[PDB]
Amino acid sequence: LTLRALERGDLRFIHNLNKELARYEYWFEEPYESFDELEELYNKHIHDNAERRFVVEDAQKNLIGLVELIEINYIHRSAEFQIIIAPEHQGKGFARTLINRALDYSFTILNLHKIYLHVAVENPKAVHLYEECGFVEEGHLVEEFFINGRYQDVKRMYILQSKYLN
Template sequence: MRNELQLRPVEKEDLEFIHKMRTNPDVMDYWFSEPYTTMERLIKSYEDGQKSESHRQFILYHLNEKVGYIGLFDIHFRHRNAEFAIMIDPSHQGKGYATDATRLMVEYGFNQLNLHKISLHVINVNEKAIHIYQKVGFITEGQLKKHFFVDGSYHDALIMSLLREDYVS
């Protein structure tokens, strides 16, 4: 399936697709954000982001259908690291896209941006995501106690990372 997945930089016409996910509580709980984003705020964020070199945001496609949003954020070119995040549209979850998409983004970060390290935060109860990240090669570097408030309670967060020299494609 990996060669059927494609990444395309986010364009203004993709904002409606992103907005649909950004207002979905089930999706946003795992982005540790409130499911409240107006279209106007999203447009402003998109326009401000066009001036920044610190983010790389993509729409994930499977056979010309939008299935997710993925990116590298807070890119530090001096230190050659970035934070990874992914959002799969709920109607496309459970189809194996996340693992292949994560690999695509890791390879982009290491091979195109020459990053040395990619990291992420994930709550400890999100076992499916942790399994995916481990499958790609991410390891747990640390734990933040009761760091994120999700679904009515506080959860520990794992800090996971992958070094370029440890990645096996």
């Protein structure tokens, strides 16, 4: 597997990765639900560095998933991490590799200090494998997001540049 900076031609894969009416999606903190308004948001934030996205693809160049570093602050050197694996390539053991490739980019190139993420409390397997990757719970945000018709709690888990490098 290999990561690559997101291109305009990849936007359609993003729109198909998470189908509408199931997740209220944002692009640089701007709501979007169609491809045409997504394309305009991409053109508007093509140079904005507050959020960086990369598409992962295998040797056959079959797009497998997306990694998003959002809410990037270059003074506190923190960023929220998100990983979205394609349904067809899910369960093949790529989660750990993609997460480690994201942490590698964040701590060895961007020179960030902290990488936090929000994970649904109702997904313990993800929480456990994130802990195995090197994350630690720093918060149990109560009713943070209204998802699928319910206010859900989320575990905020972080990892520091020191741990990953050493």
